[PDB]
Amino acid sequence: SNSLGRNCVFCHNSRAFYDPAQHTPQWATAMLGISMVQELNNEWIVPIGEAHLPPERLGPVYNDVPKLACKTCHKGYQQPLQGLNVVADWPELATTEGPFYD
Amino acid sequence: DMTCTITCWGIGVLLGIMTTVGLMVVGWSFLQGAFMGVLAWLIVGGVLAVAVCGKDNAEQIRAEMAAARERVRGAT
Amino acid sequence: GTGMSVPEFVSDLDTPDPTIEVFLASTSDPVIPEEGAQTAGEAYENVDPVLADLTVENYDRLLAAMRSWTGIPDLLEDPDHYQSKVAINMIQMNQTINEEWA
Amino acid sequence: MSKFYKIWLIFDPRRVFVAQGVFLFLLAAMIHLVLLSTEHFNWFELAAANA
Amino acid sequence: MSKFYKIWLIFDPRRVFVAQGVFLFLLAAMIHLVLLSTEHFNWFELAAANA
Amino acid sequence: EETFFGNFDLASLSLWLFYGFFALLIYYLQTENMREGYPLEDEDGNTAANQGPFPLPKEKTFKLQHGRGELTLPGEDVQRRDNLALRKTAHGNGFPMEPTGDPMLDGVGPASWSKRRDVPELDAHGHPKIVPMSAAEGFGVSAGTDPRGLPVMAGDGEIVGLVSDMWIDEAEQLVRYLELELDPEWGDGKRLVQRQMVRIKSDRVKVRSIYGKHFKNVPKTKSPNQVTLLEEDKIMAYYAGGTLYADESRLEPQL
Amino acid sequence: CAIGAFVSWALREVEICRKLGMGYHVPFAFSVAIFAYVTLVVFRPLLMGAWGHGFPYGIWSHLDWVSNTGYAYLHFHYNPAHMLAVTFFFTTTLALALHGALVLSAANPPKGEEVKGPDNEDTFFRDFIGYSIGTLGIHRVGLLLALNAGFWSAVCIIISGPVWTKGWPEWWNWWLEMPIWP
Amino acid sequence: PEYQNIFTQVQVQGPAELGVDNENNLTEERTTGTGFSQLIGWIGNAQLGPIYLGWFGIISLVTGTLWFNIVGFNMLSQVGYSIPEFIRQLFWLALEPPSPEYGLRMPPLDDGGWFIIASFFLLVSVISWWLRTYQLAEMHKMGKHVAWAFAAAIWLFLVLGLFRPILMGSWSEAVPYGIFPHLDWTTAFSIRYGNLYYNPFHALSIVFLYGSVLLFAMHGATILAVTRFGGDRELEQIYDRGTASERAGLFWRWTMGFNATMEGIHRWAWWFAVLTPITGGIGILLTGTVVDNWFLWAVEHNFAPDYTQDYGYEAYTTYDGFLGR
Numbered sequence A: 001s002n003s004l005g006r007n008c009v010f011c012h013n014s015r016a017f018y019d020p021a022q023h024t025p026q027w028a029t030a031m032l033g034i035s036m037v038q039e040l041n042n043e044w045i046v047p048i049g050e051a052h053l054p055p056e057r058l059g060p061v062y063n064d065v066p067k068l069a070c071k072t073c074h075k076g077y078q079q080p081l082q083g084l085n086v087v088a089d090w091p092e093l094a095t096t097e098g099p100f101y102d
Numbered sequence B: 001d002m003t004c005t006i007t008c009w010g011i012g013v014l015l016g017i018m019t020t021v022g023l024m025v026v027g028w029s030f031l032q033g034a035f036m037g038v039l040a041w042l043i044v045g046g047v048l049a050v051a052v053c054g055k056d057n058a059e060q061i062r063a064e065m066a067a068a069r070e071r072v073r074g075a076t
Numbered sequence C: 001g002t003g004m005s006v007p008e009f010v011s012d013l014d015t016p017d018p019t020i021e022v023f024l025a026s027t028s029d030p031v032i033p034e035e036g037a038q039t040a041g042e043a044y045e046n047v048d049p050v051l052a053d054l055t056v057e058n059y060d061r062l063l064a065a066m067r068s069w070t071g072i073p074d075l076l077e078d079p080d081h082y083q084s085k086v087a088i089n090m091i092q093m094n095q096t097i098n099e100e101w102a
Numbered sequence D, E: 001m002s003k004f005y006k007i008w009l010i011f012d013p014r015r016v017f018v019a020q021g022v023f024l025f026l027l028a029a030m031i032h033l034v035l036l037s038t039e040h041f042n043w044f045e046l047a048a049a050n051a
Numbered sequence F: 001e002e003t004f005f006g007n008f009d010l011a012s013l014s015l016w017l018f019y020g021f022f023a024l025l026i027y028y029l030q031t032e033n034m035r036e037g038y039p040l041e042d043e044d045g046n047t048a049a050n051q052g053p054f055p056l057p058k059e060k061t062f063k064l065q066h067g068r069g070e071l072t073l074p075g076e077d078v079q080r081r082d083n084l085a086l087r088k089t090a091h092g093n094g095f096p097m098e099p100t101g102d103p104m105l106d107g108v109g110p111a112s113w114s115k116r117r118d119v120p121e122l123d124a125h126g127h128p129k130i131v132p133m134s135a136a137e138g139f140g141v142s143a144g145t146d147p148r149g150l151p152v153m154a155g156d157g158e159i160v161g162l163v164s165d166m167w168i169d170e171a172e173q174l175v176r177y178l179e180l181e182l183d184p185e186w187g188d189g190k191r192l193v194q195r196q197m198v199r200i201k202s203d204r205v206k207v208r209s210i211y212g213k214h215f216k217n218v219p220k221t222k223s224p225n226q227v228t229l230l231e232e233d234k235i236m237a238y239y240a241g242g243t244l245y246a247d248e249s250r251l252e253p254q255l
Numbered sequence G: 001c002a003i004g005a006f007v008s009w010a011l012r013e014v015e016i017c018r019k020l021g022m023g024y025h026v027p028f029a030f031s032v033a034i035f036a037y038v039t040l041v042v043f044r045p046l047l048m049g050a051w052g053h054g055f056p057y058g059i060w061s062h063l064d065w066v067s068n069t070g071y072a073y074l075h076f077h078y079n080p081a082h083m084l085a086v087t088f089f090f091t092t093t094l095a096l097a098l099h100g101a102l103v104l105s106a107a108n109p110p111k112g113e114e115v116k117g118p119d120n121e122d123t124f125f126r127d128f129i130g131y132s133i134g135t136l137g138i139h140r141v142g143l144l145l146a147l148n149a150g151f152w153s154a155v156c157i158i159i160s161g162p163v164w165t166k167g168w169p170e171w172w173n174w175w176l177e178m179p180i181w182p
Numbered sequence H: 001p002e003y004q005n006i007f008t009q010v011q012v013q014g015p016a017e018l019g020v021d022n023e024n025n026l027t028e029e030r031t032t033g034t035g036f037s038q039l040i041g042w043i044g045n046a047q048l049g050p051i052y053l054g055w056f057g058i059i060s061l062v063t064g065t066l067w068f069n070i071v072g073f074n075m076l077s078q079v080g081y082s083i084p085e086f087i088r089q090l091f092w093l094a095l096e097p098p099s100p101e102y103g104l105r106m107p108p109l110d111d112g113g114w115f116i117i118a119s120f121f122l123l124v125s126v127i128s129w130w131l132r133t134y135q136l137a138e139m140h141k142m143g144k145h146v147a148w149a150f151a152a153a154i155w156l157f158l159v160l161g162l163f164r165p166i167l168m169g170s171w172s173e174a175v176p177y178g179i180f181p182h183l184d185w186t187t188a189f190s191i192r193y194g195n196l197y198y199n200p201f202h203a204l205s206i207v208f209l210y211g212s213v214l215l216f217a218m219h220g221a222t223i224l225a226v227t228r229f230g231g232d233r234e235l236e237q238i239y240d241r242g243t244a245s246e247r248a249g250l251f252w253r254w255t256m257g258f259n260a261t262m263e264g265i266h267r268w269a270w271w272f273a274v275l276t277p278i279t280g281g282i283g284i285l286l287t288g289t290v291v292d293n294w295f296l297w298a299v300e301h302n303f304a305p306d307y308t309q310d311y312g313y314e315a316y317t318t319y320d321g322f323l324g325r
């Protein structure tokens, strides 16, 4: 809630926190975001930094590597940059294959 | 002599407000200044009410009243 | 009647994200590839992810976008520096995010 | 300044003594703590730094 | 300085003694705890680090 | 966990048991509160045909202190008034009553009093509970404004006399009554005022309930050193009756 | 209709008090409950800008509204006025229990024993806890406690929507970030 | 306006009252020494003390002090013995119950031993106080209504701390000793087992709490209204009925069609207050042991409301429309 700037009744009905028939469509987006965050942390962000980052960027205890979460992108807003289209001008960062300028 | 006590309480409230505004001036926030202002109210108001209003009016009654307790003590 | 709502101050709804205007001042339109355009691999010595791009595309993505969005003024100049190796992986991570997590 | 002794003809010595005893200790404690809240005058940390 | 014995003619020694004892014990406990709160003078941890 | 039948489980059994217990408790509580004022009567003083769905409770006995006997309830009404100067304004039930003479002097309406015992209330030692301040040893004013010596102003702005004494409650250290010495113009003797109906100021004491002319007819105490329950009731209610009967405008609609 | 009925009930109580020649404390006490209800259904929706912020008229559907409104601020237990109101409620219940028990025990001694008086109750509570409030101060205390509970409930509900917007736990950052702390 | 009898106009002070006595010799254990407070004399009595010092009281005081000191020193040690940090985080610290993995066995000192020791001390202290309140009433020749009303709350105390953890077979089901942690426990307990609103006994306890608060407001207002007729001396009114009781009864009879007596209203008050912790403990004891989801229980028992409209903000407005773009 503090990451999106919303509250519990956003995505939930508090009289039944478990019932799938009393959720909103944003619940599914959050459920997808959980898996996306897990994959990003366990596949890309952590394997790198463990081999290149200097010691000065490792945290107070455990000497970890910095990780990302919801607020790394949302930063206290419902949508990052309040829904700005940041990919229409950069086809090179949209597809792993050859860029499609069509 | 409840009027003097109420006057002391009002002085404490005014001092708390003044200290709160001064704390805004220094660079604190509203609640941070308000807490210290309330502290000042209660402490200074209580101290003034106990001390200043504890000087009940008397010119020669006080001395004999003080002297009377100097006689009860010393033989008890 | 269920009490399901999200309150917000009117004076806070009118204040946009203070970083939206920064992005719009550091973006540019793409350049449509021509017939037989010279790629960035035939003009410098670079990494394979960024080797098939054109010269103008490499220009307006390398300096105009990446060296300002991350505030590293000399990104991707010395190939042995750790920041370049991190950025090369971050490009692919961004591509995967945009493709496989639509 | 030779007639300062008349203050004991007005103020109760016991109440004034109690008030002064509280106030002096309170002021000393606050002064010591204020000296402890800085970096240049913190002997506890200075001993560890010089060890 | 030679007439300091007159203080007992003003204050009852019972309350003074009780207050002195309580104040001394509380101050000693506070000072020992403050010494415990640091790293340089924490004698238990120093003994643990020397074994 | 399982069910006995259908959806019935331990929680339902507990709920139904609580329902039964609550019904019985409500019956007991309502029946316990019918020890005064029953059986009901009509407006002619006869027993009414309807008495309600709750029957009368059984008897209980109170053993009183200082050898004053015993009290058994429910029973006969010993505080009943004998001859009331009242008149019916209708032939049936449900309509008000009309005073026959002077309501303040006849003790009807908001000036009504109950026929209590004609003996003073006693403390733990067996002494009268309320005593004048001139006979209580070691009592003195510790806070507030001392009302003794101040003039008394009535409800219409008339000064009737000075406050001469206070009657205090020794057991609870509380002031109960203020004694008043009347000017010869406004009457003779002394009268008592309950502390709950006065407003002490720095220079005067004001009684807004009654006017100046109503001060000579305040009931007097038989003894100068004590007061009984019956006298307190009559004095206290006389003072309460003035909120309605001291003027014609206090009785008519305010609008 | 409900607002009209409540006001008429209060004024009828006023008329009965005037006829019986007693004080007007009961209508004044009822006015606080009327104030709390009006704050719930009138003042807060008026400040928030819609009549849809009032609770529904259902036996079991007016609790879902309470739940959803409480969870709209993340943790409603961290509201200080809610703390004050809950404390007042608990204190009022305890005081009522003690007063009833003391009066009943004084009026109902063991079988074969005489009844008691105010002196006995005063001794009991001074022996019990070291202080007695008296037969007159207890009623003042109870009335004040109930009125304070109602008033602080109204304040707690009215500050939640139009004055504070974020979560309630975050409100304590003024204490957690005071300059005096090292 | 008329005097409202909320603050006393003038105070009087006399010799201090030491208390009544009988052949039980209550004087031998009472202290000597009293004080007077003029600030409190504006509302109630001014005399302070004396107090009765038995053995139950001393035992309870010492053992409760031990519990307090244990909790406080554990909280202090958890922060590094830093007094400024102890003051800063006072409302956030606690003494946590043991871990779920230890069942009903005795856990280590790091994971719940001190919690068990402090809980044992607190139990002993509470039982000692109850025994003292019974003994005092037994020696003054009075009824034991105070002891029963305390036992009413001790029942809920024990259910929340002792009986339910044993029934559930774990010491981890107790409540932590902290200001904010205990509220967190309340909310987490409500969420974990469905919705506590749909527990009927929680509703009954809420009903009785509301009724008790309403009843004290009504009774205080009524007694202050008829105080001009000596209405605060309730016992003498019970023994010898006066006009104050008649007027107080007639007010409520004309208002709502039925009334009470001077002695019967206190029975109403006693029961409404006592019935709250009893129903609360009965409702709490059934959670988890019998019912694991209260919303599903309500649905199966057909008193859960149904809604027709849709969910989501996009069914009512637009994101751009909300921002005003």
Ligand code: BCL
Residues within 6 Å of the ligand: G006, G033, G034, G036, G037, G040, G066, G067, G068, G069, G070, G071, G076, G077, G082, G085, G086, G089, G150, G152, G153, G154, G156, G157, H186
């Ligand atoms: C997720 C839920 C949140 C929460 C969310 C809220 C919200 C939201 C509210 C409070 C409110 C309250 N909370 Mg909280 N609260 C929570 C849990 C708790 C807990 C606890 C966990 O122990 C406690 C003790 C309380 C207690 C309280 C009280 C302080 C307060 C209740 C108002 C009141 O009594 O006004 C009593 C006043 C009235 C409204 C009475 C009105 C009576 C009228 C005038 C007369 C009725 C006439 C009738 C129709 C006659 C017909 C009958 C005839 C005989 C036929 N909360 C949790 C943490 N709380 C409420 C509040 O403060 O409201 C102002 C509120 O709305």
Ligand code: BCL
Residues within 6 Å of the ligand: E024, E027, E028, E029, E031, E032, E035, E041
């Ligand atoms: C690393 C060691 C810690 C320390 C650890 C402790 C511990 C632990 C304790 C104290 C205690 C005391 N310490 Mg030391 N103490 C330290 C250094 C100092 C210094 C200093 C400026 O250097 C002073 C003035 C003090 C002050 C004091 C006294 C207030 C007190 C014992 C005497 C007393 O109660 O009678 C006060 C004085 C008199 C009335 C006597 C009159 C004249 C006498 C001869 C003065 C000597 C007192 C003092 C101990 C001498 C230190 C002088 C040097 C500057 C060190 N300490 C350092 C910082 N100290 C003990 C105590 O009782 O605390 C409550 C105690 O338990």
Ligand code: BCL
Residues within 6 Å of the ligand: G066, G090, H122, H126, H153, H154, H156, H157, H160, H186, H187, H189, H190, H196, H197, H201, H202, H205, H206, H209, H276, H277, H279, H280, H281, H283, H284
């Ligand atoms: C998110 C929160 C959940 C919720 C979770 C709970 C839980 C969990 C519980 C309560 C409980 C209660 N709830 Mg609920 N409750 C909610 C919402 C509400 C709302 C509302 C929204 O308005 C209300 C009105 C209430 C109010 C209530 C009370 C009716 C009831 C407390 C019983 C009692 O007597 O407590 C008074 C407290 C006591 C009597 C405790 C015992 C006291 C003992 C005797 C203390 C001994 C003294 C001590 C050791 C010494 C101290 C030191 C001294 C200074 C010397 N709930 C929501 C839905 N509710 C309790 C209950 O019974 O529910 C069934 C309970 O456990």
Ligand SMILES: CC[C@H]1c2cc3[nH]c4c(c3C)C(=O)[C@H](C(=O)OC)c4c3nc(cc4[nH]c(cc(n2)[C@@H]1C)c(C(C)=O)c4C)[C@@H](C)[C@@H]3CCC(=O)OC/C=C(\C)CCC[C@H](C)CCC[C@H](C)CCCC(C)C
Residues within 6 Å of the ligand: G001, G002, G005, G006, G009, G026, G027, G029, G030, G032, G033, G056, G057, G058, G059, G062, G146, G147, G149, G150, H210, H213, H214, H217, H218, H221, H255, H256
């Ligand atoms: C702090 C103040 C406390 C208090 C005080 C209080 N209440 C009072 C009084 C006092 C001093 C009275 O003198 C008066 C009385 O006569 O009591 C016997 C009363 C009273 N308070 C009552 C109840 C009550 N008090 C409550 C609360 C409180 N009472 C507070 C805790 C509560 C709750 C929810 O806690 C309730 C339910 C009434 C029984 C009674 C007077 C109500 C009355 O009869 O009003 C006249 C109206 C009708 C006869 C019916 C009107 C019907 C409506 C027109 C339609 C329905 C509208 C309503 C919004 C529906 C709600 C449905 C719900 C399921 C949501």
Ligand SMILES: CC[C@H]1c2cc3[nH]c4c(c3C)C(=O)[C@H](C(=O)OC)c4c3nc(cc4[nH]c(cc(n2)[C@@H]1C)c(C(C)=O)c4C)[C@@H](C)[C@@H]3CCC(=O)OC/C=C(\C)CCC[C@H](C)CCC[C@H](C)CCCC(C)C
Residues within 6 Å of the ligand: G128, G129, G130, G131, H031, H033, H034, H035, H036, H037, H038, H039, H048, H049, H050, H051, H060, H061
């Ligand atoms: C909510 C009820 C709880 C409670 C309440 C309570 N106890 C009280 C009081 C109250 C309201 C007092 O007023 C009275 C007291 O003296 O308070 C300062 C007291 C008291 N209960 C005490 C103890 C006590 N009560 C206990 C029980 C409880 N205290 C209940 C659980 C316990 C427990 C739980 O074990 C203990 C240990 C004593 C400290 C004290 C009994 C008074 C006595 O024996 O002598 C006091 C008299 C004097 C010698 C002088 C007055 C004391 C002043 C502090 C000094 C001078 C002040 C001046 C005279 C006026 C005071 C100003 C006011 C603002 C107080």
Ligand SMILES: CC[C@H]1c2cc3[nH]c4c(c3C)C(=O)[C@H](C(=O)OC)c4c3nc(cc4[nH]c(cc(n2)[C@@H]1C)c(C(C)=O)c4C)[C@@H](C)[C@@H]3CCC(=O)OC/C=C(\C)CCC[C@H](C)CCC[C@H](C)CCCC(C)C
Residues within 6 Å of the ligand: G090, G091, G093, G094, G097, G098, G129, H060, H061, H063, H064, H065, H068, H125, H126, H129, H133, H146, H149, H150, H152, H153, H273, H274, H277
């Ligand atoms: C009918 C149910 C209601 C109820 C009733 C009730 N409570 C009761 C009683 C009754 C009938 C008592 O007879 C008993 C009592 O003594 O009342 C005065 C009590 C009591 N209910 C209490 C608390 C309480 N009641 C609560 C609620 C309720 N109790 C219900 C609403 C609640 C809550 C959560 O709502 C609490 C917190 C206590 C005040 C008291 C029980 C006293 C007790 O058990 O003491 C044991 C002793 C100790 C733990 C030692 C403590 C040592 C301290 C560290 C210092 C000494 C005490 C000191 C006075 C405090 C600090 C003073 C400072 C100046 C230093």
Ligand SMILES: COC1=C(OC)C(=O)C(C/C=C(\C)CC/C=C(\C)CC/C=C(\C)CC/C=C(\C)CC/C=C(\C)CC/C=C(\C)CC/C=C(/C)CC/C=C(\C)CC/C=C(\C)CCC=C(C)C)=C(C)C1=O
Residues within 6 Å of the ligand: H218, H219, H220, H222, H223, H245, H248, H249, H252, H256, H257, H258, H259, H260, H261, H262, H265, H268
């Ligand atoms: C020490 O001191 C004290 C006392 O004393 C000794 C006391 O006692 C009390 C009181 C305390 C108690 C009794 C304890 C119990 C109390 C409670 C548990 C509190 C909770 C109470 C309730 C739940 C019950 C309250 C009930 C109410 C409010 C409803 C009752 C009201 C009505 C039925 C309607 C009111 C009637 C009116 C307005 C008059 C009719 C109107 C007219 C215009 C008349 C014209 C004629 C007609 C319309 C046709 C005929 C009308 C009829 C028959 C009316 C019925 C109509 C119906 C439709 C049914 C206290 C506090 C006290 O401290």
Ligand code: HEM
Residues within 6 Å of the ligand: A004, A026, A027, A029, A030, A033, A034, A035, A037, A069, A070, A072, A073, A074, A078, A079, A080, C097, H319
């Ligand atoms: C657990 C993880 C996350 C949660 C709970 C979350 C929450 C949400 C929700 C609910 C929405 C839809 C909002 C709406 O419908 O208005 C959303 C969309 C979005 N989120 Fe997040 N998010 C998470 C993490 C992230 C991260 C880490 C990224 C990017 C890498 C991200 C970027 C976005 C974007 C770009 C949108 C806008 C989609 C659109 O509506 O067009 N989110 N998020």
Ligand SMILES: COC(C)(C)C(=O)C/C=C(\C)CC/C=C(\C)CC/C=C(\C)CCCC/C(C)=C\CCC(C)CC/C=C(\C)CCC=C(C)C
Residues within 6 Å of the ligand: H068, H069, H070, H071, H072, H073, H076, H116, H119, H120, H122, H123, H157, H158, H159, H160, H161, H162, H175, H176, H177, H178, H179, H182
């Ligand atoms: C160190 O500094 C000093 C000296 C100043 C101090 O001492 C400081 C002290 C503090 C700052 C202390 C602060 C204390 C708190 C904030 C305490 C808070 C306490 C609670 C909220 C306690 C709640 C307790 C209980 C609850 C909610 C319910 C039920 C409990 C019980 C029934 C407990 C009884 C336990 C039993 C029966 C189990 C015993 C186990 C056996 C095996 C017999």
Ligand SMILES: [Fe+3]
Residues within 6 Å of the ligand: G099, G103, H223, H234
């Ligand atoms: Fe009462």
